[PDB]
Every structure is written in C-alpha cells, then in structure tokens.
C-alpha cells in the first residue's frame, strides 16, 4: 500500500523536475537575446 503511494509521489517529481529542467532551455533563448542586444548598435548610427 505504501509502495503504491510512492509510485504516485516519485512520479510526481518527474513532472515538477521536468518543469524546472525545462526552465534552462528557455534561459538560453532568454540570455542569447540579452547579449545580442548589447553587441548591436542601431541602424540610425
């Protein structure tokens, strides 16, 4: 019975970790914008 709950609670982590591990493939898309906006001067200059 207690092991059957652990099949719910350990697999509950595999959601919430992949939602936090998924914050790092969108940190790349974030912090490749914050650098290319600092390498770039505007067209008018």
């Amino acid at each position: 019975i207690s092991l059957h709950r652990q099949l719910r609670a350990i697999q509950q982590l595999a959601r919430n970790v992949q939602a936090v591990l998924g914050a790092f493939e969108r940190g790349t898309a974030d912090q490749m914008l914050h650098v290319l906006l600092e390498k770039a001067p505007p067209l008018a200059l």
Binding site: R8, Q11, R15
Partner: protein, 94 residues
C-alpha cells in the same frame, strides 16, 4: 448508591467487533475504578463476583481507505488509456 453510578450514564454509540465477555459469553457493560482499599472492601461485604476469568479481544482494529483524490498522469497509446489506467489504479486498492 452503586446503582446510581450505573444509571447515570447514557449508553455508548459504537459497537465493537469483539466484546469483553464471560467464559459463558455474556458481554460486559462497564468499568468501575477505585483504590485497592475500596475495591477489596466491596468484594467482601457488599458486592458479589459472578465470574473471574473473562475473555478479551486481542488484535487491534484496522482501517480501510474509502475514497480519494483521483490524480494520475502519463507520457503520451490512444487518449482513452488515461481512463483505463485509472480503473487499473483503482483495482489495486480493492
């Protein structure tokens, strides 16, 4: 006077699965508690003893899960397997 101690309590609610009974099986209603001075005074003069060796239950009562939040998941196998996996995870608790 002892009659009154026994008449002032309204009966309980619950029904145990196993009752303290005599060797004959007559069940036991209540419990008096005193010091050893008074108890041994009654058992001589005033009261009587219908039996000595009684029966007592042994195993403790247990519990069963009735109802729960239904929470599952999957990794995408049709879309109904979410449903079928529930009955699975219900069939366990039975």
């Amino acid at each position: 006077w002892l009659v009154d101690l026994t008449t002032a309590t309204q009966p309980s609610v619950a029904v145990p699965r196993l009752t303290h009974a005599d060797t004959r099986g007559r069940p036991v209603d209540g419990v008096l508690v005193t010091t050893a001075a008074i108890k041994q005074r009654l058992l001589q003069s005033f009261l009587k003893v219908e039996d000595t060796e009684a029966d007592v239950p042994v195993t403790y009562g247990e519990m069963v899960l009735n109802g729960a939040n239904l929470v599952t998941a999957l990794v995408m196998r049709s879309l109904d397997d979410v449903g079928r996996h529930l009955l699975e995870m219900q069939e366990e608790q039975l």
